[PDB]
């Protein structure tokens, strides 16, 4: 349809605020939608939504549309909002006096809260009408709107205050910046772990029994960098989950799956070396081939039971307004769980493996000083990394995970996500820590030439 250059700016504004979907999706009420929040129908029939879409677009879309087609739909919604604004004696005086950029901020509010909701801002609207930008920005910052949706409102208020697109220019610079850093993190995890996996499979010297456990670690860390970290990066750079409610449950399960398998494998490796370093002869006899494959299967079976079973059975769901809101919203994929699962998952994933690894590696330090310049220094710094890097990466998260479940207000969501990325970073550190043998080095060099 007819596009303008103003029209494209208000399109990119909400593309950032609300997201763009070029395929039919469901909104918070289960209603079929496309584009930037364009309701197709309240009918539960996907074909009926496809008929409404084809009538409006003027093409057999079969549910998929282009960006230009989404802008056609978007501009119609903007025209309707504007016609509403002009019929309302509370919004027309303010609207008529605003420049085009601040005029898009007001339309943004109406898309978020509705015509009636925005008309209740009597005093802020009067201040905007009188071009009292800083005073209007202060008053709006005190709003219920600001406290409910601070990031959205910071961007909109900056638009009222300055009349520029700076808040959205800055958001997009940040988005590309983190996307770079995320892709780098994804590269290190995948490369380092795929390098360890192939080194074991193409070298008979490396196919020992201890390194069979390290293959489990490298595999639990490989799925992390292929499925968990990449999709977890989409929530950071785009502020939303973009893949529907069903994939949020699966992604969350694969997340808890791999984190459980990876840390418990560090626990098995910690036990393995303890037996070989202390009682190497009973070690070589009791730990058979099938027993080593017995532990790894047990680790993964436990990991599936604590991830796919409770999450898909909705046992992990909290029952507050904040939690139920995120569950009904496909665009929300926050890790919000009840107290029982938050503790039970933390114990099975982190706290039990921490206690074993801490106790085991402390006793290796004990029996080393009993049977004594000395090389005890080079082995102590080694233990300091195996436990230091592990603890430093996951301890902040699993402290916040248990606390936040009881006191939701103490752990900010920003800080909570950050602690979870420290743990994500362990999947890159593990191949550096556990594959430092001369056998790996001769193999790594033989793989890269």
């Amino acid at each position: 349809d007819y596009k303008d250059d103003d029209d494209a700016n208000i399109f990119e504004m909400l593309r950032i605020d609300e997201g763009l979907r070029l395929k039919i999706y469901k909104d918070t009420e289960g209603y079929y939608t496309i584009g930037i929040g364009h309701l197709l129908t309240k009918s539960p029939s996907l074909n009926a939504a496809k008929s409404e879409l084809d009538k409006a677009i003027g093409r057999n879309t079969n549910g998929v549309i282009t960006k230009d087609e989404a802008e056609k739909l978007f501009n119609q919604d903007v025209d309707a909002a504007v016609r509403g604004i002009l019929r309302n004696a509370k919004l027309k005086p303010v609207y008529d006096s605003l420049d085009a950029v601040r005029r898009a901020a007001l339309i943004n509010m109406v898309f978020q809260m509705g015509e009636t909701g925005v008309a209740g801002f009597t005093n802020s609207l009067r201040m905007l009408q009188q071009k009292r930008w800083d005073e209007a920005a202060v008053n709006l910052a005190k709003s219920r709107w600001y406290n409910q949706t601070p990031n959205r409102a910071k961007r909109v208020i900056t638009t009222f205050r300055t009349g520029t697109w700076d808040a959205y220019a800055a958001s997009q610079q940040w988005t590309a910046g983190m996307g770079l850093l995320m892709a780098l993190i994804v590269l290190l995890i995948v490369a380092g772990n795929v390098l360890v996996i192939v080194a074991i499979a193409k070298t008979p010297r490396l196919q020992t029994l201890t390194n069979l456990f390290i293959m489990s670690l490298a595999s639990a860390d490989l799925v992390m960098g292929l499925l968990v970290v990449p999709f977890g990066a989409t929530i950071v750079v785009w502020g939303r989950w973009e893949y529907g409610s069903f994939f949020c449950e699966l992604w969350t399960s694969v997340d808890v799956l791999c984190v459980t398998a990876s840390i418990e494998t560090l626990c098995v490796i910690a036990l393995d070396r303890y037996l070989a370093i202390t009682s190497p002869f009973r070690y070589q006899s009791l730990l058979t081939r099938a027993r080593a494959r017995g532990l790894v299967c047990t680790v993964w079976a436990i990991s599936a039971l604590v991830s796919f079973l409770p999450i898909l059975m909705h046992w992990w769901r909290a029952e507050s307004d904040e939690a139920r809101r995120c569950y009904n919203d496909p665009k929300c994929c926050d890790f919000v769980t009840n107290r029982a699962y938050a503790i039970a998952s933390s114990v099975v994933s982190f706290y039990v493996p921490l206690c074993i690894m801490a106790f085991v590696y402390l006793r290796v330090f004990r029996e080393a000083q009993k049977q004594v310049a000395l090389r005890e220094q080079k082995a102590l710094k080694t233990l300091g990394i195996i436990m230091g890097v592990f603890t430093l990466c996951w301890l902040p998260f699993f402290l916040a995970n248990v606390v936040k479940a009881f006191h939701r207000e103490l752990v900010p969501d920003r800080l909570f996500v950050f602690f979870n990325w420290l743990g994500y970073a362990n999947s890159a550190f593990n191949p550096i820590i556990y594959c430092r043998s001369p056998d790996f080095r001769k193999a790594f060099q033989g793989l890269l030439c």
Partner: nanobody, 120 residues
Framework: QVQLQESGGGLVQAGGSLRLSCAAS????????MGWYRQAPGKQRELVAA???????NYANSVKGRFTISRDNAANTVYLQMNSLKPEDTAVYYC??????????????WGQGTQVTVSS
């Protein structure tokens, strides 16, 4: 850096005895395995006696009873007091040391070897 010296090798008649001595210089981690390996012409390398820093032993069952391995208190040396020699024990005996300074893997220290031929 770390070198291990290898003494006690020689030729002896069937039924005699020997006493291999291996002294390892350099610094090593407190938990280790000092062992002896033999390779006869033809057949590949095999272990005879290993001794852990705690005291636990492991003797090849074709070799146990006749052979005894020991460690020195406050000295990085291993002694293989061997008796009742048989002509099937003609092999170069190697001194091996398992270092556990890096906790995740084993770090082998090998030796040059001492020839041992048993006559009749």
């Amino acid at each position: 850096q770390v070198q291990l010296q290898e003494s006690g090798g020689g030729l002896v008649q069937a039924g005699g005895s020997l006493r291999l001595s291996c002294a390892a210089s350099g610094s090593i981690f407190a938990l280790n395995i000092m062992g002896w390996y033999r390779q006869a012409p033809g057949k590949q390398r095999e272990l005879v006696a290993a001794i852990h820093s705690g005291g636990t032993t492991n003797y090849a069952n074709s070799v146990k009873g006749r052979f005894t391995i020991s460690r020195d208190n406050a000295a990085n040396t291993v002694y293989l007091q061997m008796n009742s020699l048989k002509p099937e024990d003609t092999a170069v005996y190697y001194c091996n040391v398992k270092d556990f300074g890096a906790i995740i893997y084993d770090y082998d220290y090998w030796g040059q070897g001492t020839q041992v031929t048993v006559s009749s």
